[PDB]
Amino acid sequence: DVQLVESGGGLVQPGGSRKLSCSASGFAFSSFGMHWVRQAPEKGLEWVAYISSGSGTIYYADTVKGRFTISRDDPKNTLFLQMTSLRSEDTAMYYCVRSIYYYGSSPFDFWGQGTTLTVSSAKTTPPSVYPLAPGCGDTTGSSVTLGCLVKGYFPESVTVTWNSGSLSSSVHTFPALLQSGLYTMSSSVTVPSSTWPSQTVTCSVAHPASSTTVDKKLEPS
Amino acid sequence: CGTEGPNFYVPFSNKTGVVRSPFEAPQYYLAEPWQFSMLAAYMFLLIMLGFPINFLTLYVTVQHKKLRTPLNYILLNLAVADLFMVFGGFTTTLYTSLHGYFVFGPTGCNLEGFFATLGGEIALWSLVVLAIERYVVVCKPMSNFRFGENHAIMGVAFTWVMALACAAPPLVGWSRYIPEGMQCSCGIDYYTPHEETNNESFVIYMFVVHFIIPLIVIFFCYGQLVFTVKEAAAQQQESATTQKAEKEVTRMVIIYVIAFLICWLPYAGVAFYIFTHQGSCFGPIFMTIPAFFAKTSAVYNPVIYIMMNKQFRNCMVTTLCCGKNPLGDDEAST
Amino acid sequence: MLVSKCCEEFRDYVEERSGEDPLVKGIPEDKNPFKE
Amino acid sequence: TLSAEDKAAVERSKMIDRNLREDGEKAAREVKLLLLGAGESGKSTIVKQMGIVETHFTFKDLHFKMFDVGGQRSERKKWIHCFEGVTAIIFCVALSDYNRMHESMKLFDSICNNKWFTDTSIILFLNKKDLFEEKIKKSPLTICYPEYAGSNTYEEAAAYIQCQFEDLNKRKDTKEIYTHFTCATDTKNVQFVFDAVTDVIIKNNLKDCGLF
Amino acid sequence: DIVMTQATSSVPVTPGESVSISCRSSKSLLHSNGNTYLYWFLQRPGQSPQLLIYRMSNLASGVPDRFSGSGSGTAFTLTISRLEAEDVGVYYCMQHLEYPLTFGAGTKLELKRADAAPTVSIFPPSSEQLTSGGASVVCFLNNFYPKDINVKWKIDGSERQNGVLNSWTDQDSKDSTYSMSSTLTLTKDEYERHNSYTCEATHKTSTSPIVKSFNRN
Amino acid sequence: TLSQITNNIDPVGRIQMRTRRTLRGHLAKIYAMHWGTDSRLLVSASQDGKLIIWDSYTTNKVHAIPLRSSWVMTCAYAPSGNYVACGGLDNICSIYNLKTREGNVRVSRELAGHTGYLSCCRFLDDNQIVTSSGDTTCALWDIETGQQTTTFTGHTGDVMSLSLAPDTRLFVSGACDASAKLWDVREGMCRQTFTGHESDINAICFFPNGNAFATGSDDATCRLFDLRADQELMTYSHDNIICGITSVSFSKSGRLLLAGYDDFNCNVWDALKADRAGVLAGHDNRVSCLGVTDDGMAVATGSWDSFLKIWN
Ligand SMILES: *[C@@H]1O[C@H](CO)[C@@H](O[C@@H]2O[C@H](CO)[C@@H](O)[C@H](O)[C@H]2NC(C)=O)[C@H](O)[C@H]1NC(C)=O
Ligand SMILES: *C/C=C(C)/C=C/C=C(C)/C=C/C1=C(C)CCCC1(C)C
């Protein structure tokens, strides 16, 4: 029934501005109140903004009172959130949240799909992906794990598959970390010493900002 | 002809030395004391008549819940006008009549004149917008208008606006409040030659705003209304009850015309003749008369509106011995 | 089964109900949201 | 001490109460032009150029409403007990298919000064009054009435119908009955009832605005 | 402002038993109206949160009745009668007494299993990583329990502090394990100056640190 | 009898019913109102096409519901707290579902099939509904699918209103030929018929144990009745009043009795000593229907005033 499609994510230059929109459909947009809520990376969540029925009553939190703007457009079912003076400490996923208030009524009881806002000077960079394997005097037992390390990039996320997705359980995937502000992450697969060198196994990196997919076959010493 | 002064002006001869200010001395040296005696006696009569009607007015207002319609607020504002005048115009002048002179100074003069003239103006605009609301309800001159409570409350707002439009200016020195005529009354200068309080501007303002415009709009609304009832009663040349309604509508409109004209037309006649005959001299007995009939008109303002509305002159049927009005449950169980 | 018996039954239900009724027993205003 | 979190819970009550009252705005700008009677009542050509029934016909800047039942002495308890605010009793009556006249006598005795709708405005339309002038001569109305005390014409006939409505009135004064002498039924009646309801709303204004 | 208080991480409860998670307040959150205005949220990973308990006392739509709430005037605890395989994830407390609202801090509900063996792997940088200059020696560590673990780095036998980065996955539920990878970010000279290199892992499951090594020779 | 057996009961005193809460809002006559079940919410039905449910504690408007047809004679409220039930003239028994729908409250069943006007409706649970119309007959229904499951006959006149005893399994009926009949809900053979009035009976309710009831009528002569006895038990009549009595509802203890009249008062009666126990003035117009809560804490009146009043 209910579709709360966010729109307006992506990268924002610091101290700048951006509008957000929740395409709302399936529910009578008049008699509800909206809440904007924010979820930081690996932090506790936090309340931002309230608008009521009747489009008048407006509340903010501490740090963004006076710099954010909440409004609703009832012929367009549309929650506008204009943010101004955006800084790195609000790089977060936001949600827009349905509400309804009276006695025996249930606030917050639906949630959006969420969207990403990222405040950095980080330009979009094609990454550098590297294969990892045994070396010079490095000897072989039964099976060997073989890994791919992607370093030095910025979308928020990249992806990597394996021979266009040819194995799932032996692949593990280590999430990312900042280093000089550059994202870095890795993933891995483990194969026996018989299946390789006898088969072709290729890690496959997609870069969803610049749309760049480079594939690397595993190689021995 | 007269005698000036800083706060006082008496139109009487001070070549015989007898003129002193009524802040200073009793004014029996020009008037008979029995004049003041009979004046005080009929002031006593009119206060005794004019208070209990406003008493039972607000008592029948609050007690019977049927009556606080959007079509009845202006009778309540007229009752406020009569209450202001009964409290703050009458007994103070009665007090100074028992003295035969004034005792309160120009500050108490400003007070007493403020209360009295403010009540008079509120009564004026009560008459005005009663006429306007009956015009708009019966005629519908603008296409697609209908009446809510909000327009009546905005009307009461307009009454207080036109109240302030007169009660203010002698507070800010442009033409002041003084004792006046026989000086037992306080009010506004309008007849002493003095451009320093800038009198003629306030004369034009008062005359046009508070007398010409209201007279215009009451004759306008009542002409359109009476001709409308003539047209409607002409559409049905065989209804008796519509022709009844025609006759008592004509009767009551002509009654309100007579009442309003007697209520104000003397003051306009005074300013009329004096500005017509600029520089003329008179007596304070002469000048006293129109204010006397003005406060008399403040007495008969319940007579024309309150004491004759059919829906509301049930009250005097139920008043003259006891009191019981519809929370007495005229129910007629069938 | 005649009437006075049933009326005694009606009694016997009415009797031990004053402690629950907030009207006949009446009510203190702190024990009612009807303060204004 | 109630300044706690319910500043939507009263704010909702403002948002619902404004749209509560603004339903009353386009209430009563219309009036309710109500169809009554039985068969042969002559309101089919009325409703021709014009649940149970409504309509929405307008003429000269005033939208109208209109509703319909029929079959008196059993449909009475409907509208005496649970109608309201009628400005138009269209008491269309059959004139050659009657009986159903003491129907009207005891009905108008029951309605005229009972506490719910003493203040009704009962307007008769002798629809197809040529059928009435035919019926009173083919059948002298002394069959229905003992006290037929007039001549042999239409004026005292229609006036005596107006009598025998209000002959069981017995304590009141008037109704101001707007008897359209109904012509050949494709006739201009919209103007008739138009300024008729104009005069009834004018007298409803003046009864409630001081001037009588 | 008013502060909610939780415990951050918690015991993996065994799938099939009850569990209880608390949160308490920096003020008496009960108002004179009668009911304390408190909110218990569920969030699954990679998802969007639906609520569990509105106003401290009541389950919501589309939630089974195993989420029995418990309330004082000040301290509050949600009790689950049985941990099913799908109530995994993060829990939040969030009061609703005044504006603005702060939330809790998050508390994780996990899965409990046996011990597991740390699977170890060492990797020196191959040739194009060598041409990158700042080398990258990695050590992978898989399928072990819990991810509380320690890593030692004897570079020419020397327990090097700098250049050590660590990264943990979440509870990979295809085998209910954890997996951690650590890199050794190096320069050119930090690579060339030494000869011997050891990763040494220490997990709870034994006293023996598992060693993996190589030599630049 | 009751009356000559009442020789043991010490009197009750005089108790002030203080007019606590005044509900504004309406614009027309109000033909109907009825409660929640946690003694807090109140449905209310008035002539101007809107249908209002209410939180009497904090005294503010909770919902107003559009109808498409502007004629009401009843409304009931489901003891879940999810279904409102609005009737009418045009036989469209409109069931609206409150909570589970998101935003709206729209119909899920228009029970159609009654010939004449639909007089009263009462809920059992979220399943069924018992209804009474002008078709001389009444019916139990099944709103899950819309089949008129069971329908009972017997009268010669239009039905006016209908009543439950809260163990949900008996019902009793009132119709314009001065008839009050008993029907067991499930089977419903023609059990027994009740006379004693001369008027079309206009209200009836049940003594909350489940053993007796009482009828109020506009011939100003209320009565009380056993489940078995078929004759008069206790007569209720101010000898000085001949304007009739529009609605009736017992209090929680069964010590009291409400009645609103045509002279715009609600006399509160002792349910024991046949006395005027007290008086309720303040009504602008005639008391349409009055309602006691489920604990007898408050009591409420809806009248033609376009207002509701809360007595304590
Ligand atoms: C009227 O004029 C007379 C003089 O013609 C004034 O009388 C004098 O007033 C002053 C001050 O009050 C006294 O000092 C004199 O003694 C008075 N004259 C005599 C002969 O006694 C009188 O003040 C004037 N009155 C007014 C009101 O202006
Ligand atoms: C108790 C005394 C009362 C109510 C008198 C009040 C006086 C006025 C409202 C003023 C009237 C005029 C002027 C002196 C100047 C212009 C012409 C008039 C008639 C408006």
> CATH number, domain at A207?
2.60.40.10
Q: Name the pairing type of β-strands F256-261 and F245-249.
A: antiparallel
Side chain identity, residue B8: F
**What are the C-alpha distances in Å from F296 to residues A103, B120, C23, C26, F249?**
21, 55, 8, 11, 11
Which of C6, C14, C32 is nearest residue F254 as measured by Cβ atoms?
Answer: C14
Q: Is residue B236 part of a domain?
A: yes
End-of-domain residue from the set A68, A96, A119: A119
Query: Per the structure block, which two tokens stand in for F114?
Result: 């009654």
Whether B297 lines ligand 1, by a CB cut-off of 6 Å, is no
Distance (Å, whole) CA E95 – CA E38 = 4
CB contact under 8 A, D12 and A53: yes
Q: With beta carbons less than 8 A apart as the criterion, state whether E172 and E190 touch.
A: no
Task: Say yes or no: D51 contacts chain F, CB-CB below 8 A.
Answer: yes
Range of the structural domain that residue C9 is part of: 1-35
Q: Please provide residue B221's backbone torsions phi and psi, each rounded to the nearest 5 degrees.
A: -65, -40
Cβ neighbours of residue D44 under 8 Å, at least 6 residues apart?
A: none
CATH of domain F1-312: 2.130.10.10
- Which of A14, E134, A12, B230 lies closest to D199 in space, CA to CA? B230
**Touch F-B: 3+ C-beta pairs under 8 A:** yes
Q: Does E79 reach chain A within 8 Å, measured CB to CB?
A: no
Residue contact B331–F264, C-beta within 8 A: yes
Q: For ligand 2, atom 14, which residue shows the shortest CA distance?
A: B190
Residues A140 and A90 placed together within one structural domain of the fold? no
Decide if F70 contacts F49 (C-beta within 8 A): yes
Phi/psi class of residue B274: alpha, beta or left (left: φ > 0; alpha: ψ in -120 to 50)? alpha
* Domain match, E10 and E103 both: yes
- The residue in chain A having the minimum alpha-carbon distance to the alpha carbon of residue D13 is A102
Query: Dmax of chain E from CA atoms?
Result: 77
Residues E94 and E20 in one domain: yes
Q: How far apart are CA F44 and CA C3, in angstroms?
A: 38
Of F90, F53, F54, nearest to F69 by C-alpha is F90
Residue B79, ligand 1, Cβ within 6 A: no
Q: What is the CATH number of the domain that holds C15?
A: 4.10.260.10
- Closest-CA residue to B202 (of B187, B190, B215): B190
Residue nearest to atom 5 of ligand 2 (CA): B117
Q: Which domain holds residue B171?
A: 33-317
Centroid of ligand 1 to alpha carbon of B6 (angstroms)? 15
Method: cryo-EM
Count CB atoms within 10 A of the CB of residue D6: 16
Strand partners of residue E13: E111
Tell whether ligand 2 has an atom less than 6 A from the beta carbon of residue B167: no
Neighbouring-strand partners of residue A58: A51
Largest Cα–Cα separation, chain F:
58
Quote the number of domains for chain A.
2
Whole-angstrom CA distances from B152 to A213, B76, D191, D193, D207 are 75, 12, 33, 31, 18
Q: How far is CA B243 from CA B215, B233, B235, B247, B316, in A?
A: 27, 6, 11, 6, 26
Query: F interface mutation test: which of B67, B69, B327 has the most F CBs within 10 A?
Result: B327
Residue E55 and residue E33 in one domain: yes
Looking at this protein, which amino acid is placed at residue E198? Answer: T
- Asked if residue D39 belongs to a known ligand binding site, the reply is no
Q: Look up tokens 């007169």; give the residue.
A: B166
> Cα–Cα distance between F214 and F235 in angstroms, integer?
10
Question: CA E33, E34, E37, E39 torsion: positive or negative?
Answer: negative
**Which residues on chain D are in Cβ contact (under 8 Å) with F29?**
84
For residue A192, give its domain range.
128-217
Whether E103 and E186 map to the same domain: the answer is no
Which of B210, B288, B297 best tests ligand 2's pocket when mutated (most atoms within 8 Å of CB)? B210
Q: Are B263 and B294 in contact (CB under 8 A)?
A: yes
- Provide the 3-class DSSP secondary structure of residue A1: coil
Same domain, A85 and A67: yes
In contact, B329 and F243? CB cutoff 8 Å: no
For residue B91, give the CATH number of its domain.
1.20.1070.10
Nearest ligand 2 atom to alpha carbon B264: 19
Give the span between the Cα atoms of A95 and A116, in whole angstroms: 9
With CA atoms as reference, the chain E residue closest to A134 would be E123
Show me where the domains of chain F are located: 1-312
Q: Which atom of ligand 2 is nearest to the CA of B291?
A: 2
A169 in the same domain as A111: no
How would you class B20 by CB atoms within 10 Å of its CB: exposed for 0-12, middle for 13-18, buried for 19 or more? middle
The DSSP bridge partners found for residue F280 are F266
Same domain, E120 and E37: no
On whether residue B259 sits in a domain, the answer given is yes
Is A62 found in the same domain as A155? no
- What tokens does A39 get? 């979820």
Q: State the resolution, in angstroms.
A: 4.4
F200 near F178, Cβ under 8 Å?
yes
DSSP notation for D85-103: --SEEEEE--SS----SHH
| C-beta of residue A166 within 8 angstroms of C-beta of residue A142 | no
Task: Check if the beta carbon of residue C18 is closer than 8 Å to that of residue C26.
Answer: no
Mark yes or no for CB contact A114/E48 under 8 Å. yes
Pick from B313, A19, F138, A32: nearest CA to D212: B313
The pairs formed by B149-152 with CB atoms below 8 angstroms and a separation of 24 or more are B149/B70, B151/B70, B152/B70, B152/B71, B152/B73, B152/B74
| Residue contacts between A and F (CB atoms, under 8 Å) | 20
F21/D67 Cα distance (integer angstroms): 38
Element (H, E) at B248: helix B240-276
Phi first, then psi, for residue B159 (nearest 5°) are -65, -45
Q: Is the pair B, C in contact (3+ CB pairs within 8 Å)? A: no
Q: Is B13 in the pocket of ligand 1 (CB under 6 A)?
A: no
Q: CA nearest F217: which of F243, F239, F193?
A: F243
Residue carrying the six token digits 């309150």: B306
Give E-chain residues touching A106 at CB under 8 angstroms. Answer: 54, 60-61
**From the CA of B26, how far away is ligand 1's center (Å)?**
15
CA distance F219 to F200: 8
- Residue D6, chain A, CB below 8 Å: the answer is yes
Q: How many angstroms separate the CA atoms of D203 and D178, rounded?
A: 14
Same domain, A110 and A150: no
A45, F7, F258 from A180: Cα distances, Å: 26, 97, 81
Q: DSSP characters for A165-194?
A: T--SSS-EEEEEEEETTEEEEEEEEEEETT
* D22-197 CATH, one of 3.40.50.300, 3.40.50.720, 3.40.50.1370, 3.50.50.60: 3.40.50.300
CA of B118 from ligand 2 middle (Å) equals 10
Is the domain of A19 the same as that of A71? Answer: yes
Residue type, F118: L
Locate F262 and state its tokens: 């045509």
Pair (A62, A140) in one structural domain? no
User: How many H helices and E strands in chain D?
Assistant: 6, 3
Domain CATH number, residue E1: 2.60.40.10
CA distance linking residue B268 with residue E171, whole number of Å: 98
Answer yes or no: do E83 and E148 share one domain.
Answer: no
Judge whether E99 is closer than 8 Å to chain A, CB to CB: yes
CA-closest residue to ligand 2 atom 18: B207
Task: Give the count of domains, chain E.
Answer: 2
Contact residues, D window 37-66, toward A, CB-based 8 Å cutoff = none
Shared domain for E102 and E6, answered yes or no, is: yes
Question: Beta strands A115-119 and A10-12: pairing type?
Answer: parallel
Q: How far apart are CA F29 and CA F44, in angstroms?
A: 11
Q: Which atom of ligand 2 lies closest to the CA of B166?
A: 9
Question: Is the minimum CB–CB distance between D84 and chain B shorter than 8 Å?
Answer: no
F130 burial via Cβ count (<10 Å: 0-12, 13-18, 19+): buried
User: b/e map of F245-283 (b: 16 or more CB within 10 Å)?
Assistant: bbbbbbbbbbbbbbbbbbbbbbbbbbbbebeebbebebb
Domain boundary among E113, E139, E158: E113
Partner residue opposite C21 with nearest CB, options F9, F212, F251: F251
> Which ligand lies nearest the alpha carbon of B6?
1
Structure letter (DSSP) for residue A67:
T
CB of residue B123 inside a 6 A radius of ligand 2: no
Confirm whether residue B278 is marked as ligand binding.
yes
Atom of ligand 1 nearest to the CA of B5: 28
B237 in any annotated domain: yes
Both structure tokens of E203? 């997990």
Among chain A residues, CA nearest to D15: A54
Cα–Cα distance, F302 to F240 (Å, whole number): 25
Non-local CB neighbours of A186 within 8 Å, separated by 6+ positions: A147, A148, A149, A150, A173, A174, E138, E167, E181, E183
Query: Within this chain, do residues A81 and A176 fall inside the same structural domain, yes or no?
Result: no
Q: What residue has token string 């209320």?
A: F222
